[PDB]
Design an enzyme around this catalytic site. Structure first.
Site, PDB file in Angstrom:
ATOM      1  N   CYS A  92       0.749  -1.172  -0.351  1.00 27.07           N
ATOM      2  CA  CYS A  92      -0.211   0.052   0.451  1.00 27.07           C
ATOM      3  C   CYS A  92       0.706   1.259  -0.037  1.00 27.07           C
ATOM      4  O   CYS A  92       0.315   2.065  -0.504  1.00 27.07           O
ATOM      5  CB  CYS A  92      -1.006   0.554   1.414  1.00 27.07           C
ATOM      6  N   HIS A 352      -9.204   2.774  -2.360  1.00 26.30           N
ATOM      7  CA  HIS A 352      -7.542   3.081  -1.824  1.00 26.30           C
ATOM      8  C   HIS A 352      -7.505   1.803  -3.328  1.00 26.30           C
ATOM      9  O   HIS A 352      -7.247   0.345  -2.950  1.00 26.30           O
ATOM     10  CB  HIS A 352      -7.896   1.740  -1.090  1.00 26.30           C
ATOM     11  N   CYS A 382       0.216   3.009   5.970  1.00 28.68           N
ATOM     12  CA  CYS A 382       0.625   2.076   6.459  1.00 28.68           C
ATOM     13  C   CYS A 382       0.793   1.195   5.486  1.00 28.68           C
ATOM     14  O   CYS A 382       0.308   1.050   3.925  1.00 28.68           O
ATOM     15  CB  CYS A 382      -0.195   1.413   7.288  1.00 28.68           C
ATOM     16  N   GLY A 384       0.580  -3.646   4.099  1.00 29.74           N
ATOM     17  CA  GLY A 384       0.717  -5.140   4.062  1.00 29.74           C
ATOM     18  C   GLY A 384       1.977  -5.422   4.567  1.00 29.74           C
ATOM     19  O   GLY A 384       2.890  -5.042   4.025  1.00 29.74           O
TER      20      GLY A 384
HETATM   21 CL   LIG Z   1       7.253  -4.354   5.646  1.00 33.85          CL
END
Ligand SMILES: [Cl-]
Ligand SMILES: [Cl-]
Ligand SMILES: [Cl-]
Ligand SMILES: [Cl-]
Ligand SMILES: [Cs+]
Ligand SMILES: [Cs+]
Ligand SMILES: [Cs+]
Ligand SMILES: [Cs+]
Ligand SMILES: [Cs+]
Ligand SMILES: [Cs+]
Ligand SMILES: [Cs+]
Ligand SMILES: [Cs+]
Ligand SMILES: [Cs+]
Ligand SMILES: [Cs+]
Ligand SMILES: [Cs+]
Ligand SMILES: [Cs+]
Ligand SMILES: [Cs+]
Ligand SMILES: [Cs+]
Ligand SMILES: [Cs+]
Lengths: 396, 395, 396, 395
Positions: A92, A352, A382, A384
């Site tokens: 992401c 997203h 952030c 994954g």
């Molecule tokens: Cl990571």
């Protein structure tokens, strides 16, 4: 970062964000990326697309996109075959890491003009057949959803990121109702910005030629979908009964791309370019993969320290809303009031497209700073696997 | 370049290179990459794995590898969960661009210890079903080979790289015979180096859980040279008049390679012994179907960035995507084969595409030591029209 | 009675070798095996030409990817006239014997004088299915369905493999893992002894596989695989720990075909053909789908009644060994001693190409009656779904 | 030999491809049609049925013995003998001939015969997963094309055998377009005048997630006629010079149909009222690609086997696999269109291939009832070169 050469943002642009299998599902990830790159460059008075030397572009689910997504984006946008092109995957955060790597490439002197950003077509992510080469002699076999496998599932625990969002809700004490009322608020902010024309400058509308009348896609598809009664009544998405995370209070799956154009100090002066903003610093951080939700609470202070800026000096933050609970938890841990966060709504309402979102929130941040007459912005996202990336900009 | 902080290589390591569906085909790309990272870090006296701050790892065919291949490599190698991890795709140049980005991250002061390199498991590249979501109402459908689609096919021309190799043979005038004699020479060099133990240091053997356990210690491809069959085989991409063959092209392969980079300050703080210094690098690109000769641009660019003359280089690694690629770049640059791929190249060793850019750097460091050289240059072309190159000084 | 209807004569039978799953005959399609057995059967009738065959009934269960009308492909591939009536028949495991019954009936109603009937199956070339590509599946892992499991071996009602229903049969009639294991060894020894004496040589038509000289498949592939200590030590296949049904005491997956030539009494004399046997009667029966294993205990008495023959008059029985427990249960339930059952071995040792086995056991039965100097025979075969078919022949 | 009586018939509505019945499997449609036929015969219990023959062509993924699933789904006893039959497009009629034969040889007294097809739920095939395919794109075979619509020897779709039919007997793009339009308004006239209401058993599709309940009562295709759109559409199988189009060919459809048959003894024993008596039948076959003309052999064979002349038939149902098929067979037999498909045909009604052989017989009895006729004949061509025909006398 002060002792490091300056990096200027001279423009940015993004596609509308399309819903999963929705308004932009006929376009590939490189077609979305090329559109965003070409629109960003068209805004810079005095700079030509042939001046772009290097491209860093995020893309997470690259299966079936073909050789080097970033190169296809660059060539599809009309950039020279001489352009250096690299595709970036930090899940992401890919779109923001790409911009960091583009800035570094100017700082070490290897380019003076760089395009960076990201793209994702979740609609066109394929399914995989993994055991056809050696075969499977007998038995039902699985077709792997590439979104689930390469986009949404933490590799270590094999659990969807929505399950780790629940762990965030449990760890930090956020109820179903707190996440739902956050979601309603960010939908209202996105709708208000949409209706006020506040995305008009950053969005490059897409013209879909008729095979039939042409179709122009002008606005983000998701914000209008808010139904407060239904949002509050829907079942939990990942934990039956006691679950707090829902499809309405989480980011959707989406298609879209975003791009920024970066130049060195020397090039800015040479071509007499008007800078939009200056990159002040950045920071990446990581922790336990299932706690990726609160990795921005590490990356944001790191980026602010790199930029030499106090948290209180920031006029607007973009904290990417992978889930409503992610924005809630990072606001709580950093002590950032919500009235400084995602002032035009966030990914829960806007969408997203995972490889593009890091660049999408930066494009939107610059529009927030202009609209709200701010000077200092910070974007954090952030990813994954346990990571986060953050970047600080000054509007000029 | 010289006015920026210095970047030192303190170790490197690679897996053996396995054949397609061969000796390493039971391992995933992150398992190969973790193995190379762990093995490179084990060689650095006075550095702990917990000191590594950031990882850049190449990987091209990431379908079904799972979230962020580089992060899986890092965690699988025992690095801290605090480590910053990014997967890089510049097709065949991914592993060298990863090292470049890692060097830049030290130079801008954002890290002092960086692991970079690349991994590929072509054996475990899946097939794709592209239209299951919207459906396809009526008609036969295709299952797309991921190697062909995301690794080996030029996107604009929709032609496999072997057909770009034929463009290279036509453009620069290399016959079937010249390509075949090049391929035999590079197989001979790889076999000579194998037998003389010259890959022992760079290769970290792989232990396969057992039947008893299997240990994979050698690159799989070099032993396959049969000069009679090579000269007699039919061309692979153009019937009759073609010049490119499977024997004189790189194979499909599995493998990984990693280097450990440190800043000057950190070298001093931990009293580390550097193996080499990065002197400079360069990327270049041109018409996509002409990617084969992009190294003729990237190599001069790297040398200029390094402040080094071409004639001062003691050894070059020119990645052998095809025999014709080495031949054409040697011709354009005026580089004698006597200085190129001194332990053999990818036609004989293999070509795991996301790893090859770091693979050739690991091998070059071994060549410079074995041949008592100081300055090396690695250059690698990539699908899409690009190439990357790097200049190192053996210390 | 049967006597108020025209008599039907078997003047010929033939079968391919039975190949193992992905084994000796895996490169041949079901119509190629079928064409082979039909041509071999017809080559054995002195005074008959292939162009005299008017109609074909051929069994085939897993017809996916075989193409339009497998029976028509078997007929045209065998050299039969394009005027031949061709119908494919699916009664699962009994298909090959029901096709013979339907052929006999077509003579008895006077619509044909020369009929070829039998069955074929290439379980090696059964495909996998993608069941939802037309409408799509928007999100989630999907399944590739094994066509053998779905269309061959799974009871549609309970969605249970027939093996688990063989386990249900062992629990019903009291047959241990040891009793099923010692029966399997015995039928394996009978199949090997028959192989050893050459008693399969007449009925089997060897297959030549092109490629310069030609490879020839002459023997059934499964009988040689007996390993008695491996068989007694293998873990159970459908119920871990306590199951009695195993892969060694079950029938395998196999490829093979078999055909018989039927003529009316008029044509028998008109062409002066020497008959091998006369069809005296048949019987179909069906009960609870999960109790198909003991359906022959209904079909066999019904076929004897239809033929006006007593169970003690029968010199040899062929009770198809879908699983060893099938033969044990039906023998117990019917009061038939094993010394008159599957005298040259059965499907546990020989193989079970499901669409062909109904005809295969009739071909073997005619061979047993010749070898052991018997006159009356009865073939009975159960099929998934609850049914069974049986046939009474008199050797002439 | 014993007489065979038809005591009732029923058919589902014919659903469009991926349309109003696409949510139902082939055994659900078949079960529905058997249950509706059996509810029409007072004095006959569903437990009186001893044997079922049911046609089905594309049986992939339908599960074990489709006819067994139809029978049990309709509530027939587990003691029932069930057999699935495939003679491609003729399966539904061939099932009935086999059922009549089973009665005539004295093995059953009450037989249910017919056919079912769910072309919406026909799957795609992956044929080489067991042995595998090491490198290259692979194919997913459309099961409709492979097992339903393609001739085995020629490997050409049925639409191309239809173009053969046009050139062999001289029917133009116009002549077929006018026939298609005629059978369309013949079909639309029957809906509004209600001549299908007796034979059709409507289907209930209940939505219970809050969704509204849905009832399917009409055939889906006849309302689609647009003659302007129809005349001006491009050809479907031969560009420019072709004569066959989607509007003038049969569609892909879902549906089922069943008849209940009884022996002479059972009709008298149970005091049943017969709808018709089966007089005779004929199967014929010729060159595979000339299957369009095979009814020209089966129809005279069925008339001769029944002992009835062609001039005595009050109505023909000649299955419209393509409009050119009806035109061709009417030309060779010398049958006027005023006695053919008087409620419409498969071009306008739909063509679920495993069921049409029984579907057209069901419609035939409705034609004889409404037209006050006595002798009806139904014939149906099938892929591979065959055809089947049957002769009935309404009572
Ligand atoms: Cl990571
Ligand atoms: Cl490139
Ligand atoms: Cl059954
Ligand atoms: Cl046929
Ligand atoms: Cs511009
Ligand atoms: Cs705009
Ligand atoms: Cs949402
Ligand atoms: Cs402030
Ligand atoms: Cs160490
Ligand atoms: Cs040290
Ligand atoms: Cs070593
Ligand atoms: Cs090679
Ligand atoms: Cs030198
Ligand atoms: Cs003969
Ligand atoms: Cs023989
Ligand atoms: Cs066995
Ligand atoms: Cs009734
Ligand atoms: Cs009705
Ligand atoms: Cs139509």
């Amino acid at each position: 970062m002060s002792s490091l050469p300056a990096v200027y943002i001279v423009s940015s642009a993004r596609t509308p964000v399309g819903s999963f299998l929705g308004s932009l599902s006929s376009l590939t990830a490189p077609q979305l990326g090329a559109h965003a790159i070409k629109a960003a460059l068209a805004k810079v008075d005095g700079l030509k697309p042939s001046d772009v030397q290097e491209v860093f572009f995020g893309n997470v689910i690259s299966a079936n996109v073909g050789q080097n997504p970033a190169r296809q984006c660059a060539l599809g946008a009309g950039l020279e075959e001489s352009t250096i092109c690299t595709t970036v995957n930090k899940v992401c955060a890919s779109g923001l890491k790409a911009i960091i790597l583009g800035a570094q490439t100017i700082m070490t002197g290897n380019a003076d003009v760089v395009v960076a950003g990201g793209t994702e077509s979740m609609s066109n992510a394929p399914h995989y057949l993994p055991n056809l080469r050696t075969g499977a002699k007998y038995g039902h076999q699985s077709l792997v959803d590439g979104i689930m496998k390469d986009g949404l599932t933490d590799a270590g625990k094999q659990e969807l990121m929505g399950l780790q969002a629940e762990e965030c809700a449990q760890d930090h004490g956020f109820s179903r109702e707190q996440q739902d009322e956050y979601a309603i608020r960010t939908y209202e902010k996105a709708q208000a910005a949409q209706k006020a024309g506040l995305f008009d400058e950053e969005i490059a509308p897409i013209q879909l030629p008729g095979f039939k009348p042409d179709v122009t896609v002008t606005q983000d598809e998701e914000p209008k979908n808010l139904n407060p009664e239904k949002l509050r009544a829907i079942k939990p998405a990942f934990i039956p009964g006691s679950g707090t995370v829902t499809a309405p209070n989480s980011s959707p799956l989406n298609d879209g791309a975003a791009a920024v154009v970066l130049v060195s100090e020397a090039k800015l002066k040479e071509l007499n370019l008007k800078p939009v903003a200056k990159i002040l610093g950045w920071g990446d951080a990581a922790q336990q993969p299932s706690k990726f939700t609160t990795a921005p609470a590490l990356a944001i202070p790191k980026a602010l320290k790199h930029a030499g800026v106090g948290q209180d000096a920031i006029d607007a933050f973009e904290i990417n809303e992978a889930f409503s609970v992610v924005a809630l938890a990072n606001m709580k841990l950093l002590g950032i009031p919500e009235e400084k966060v995602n002032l035009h709504g966030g990914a829960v309402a806007i969408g997203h497209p995972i490889g593009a979102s890091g660049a999408r929130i930066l494009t939107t941040l610059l529009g927030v700073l202009k609209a709200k007459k701010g000077k200092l912005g910070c974007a954090g996202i952030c990813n994954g696997g346990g990571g986060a990336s953050a970047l600080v900009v000054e509007l000029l």
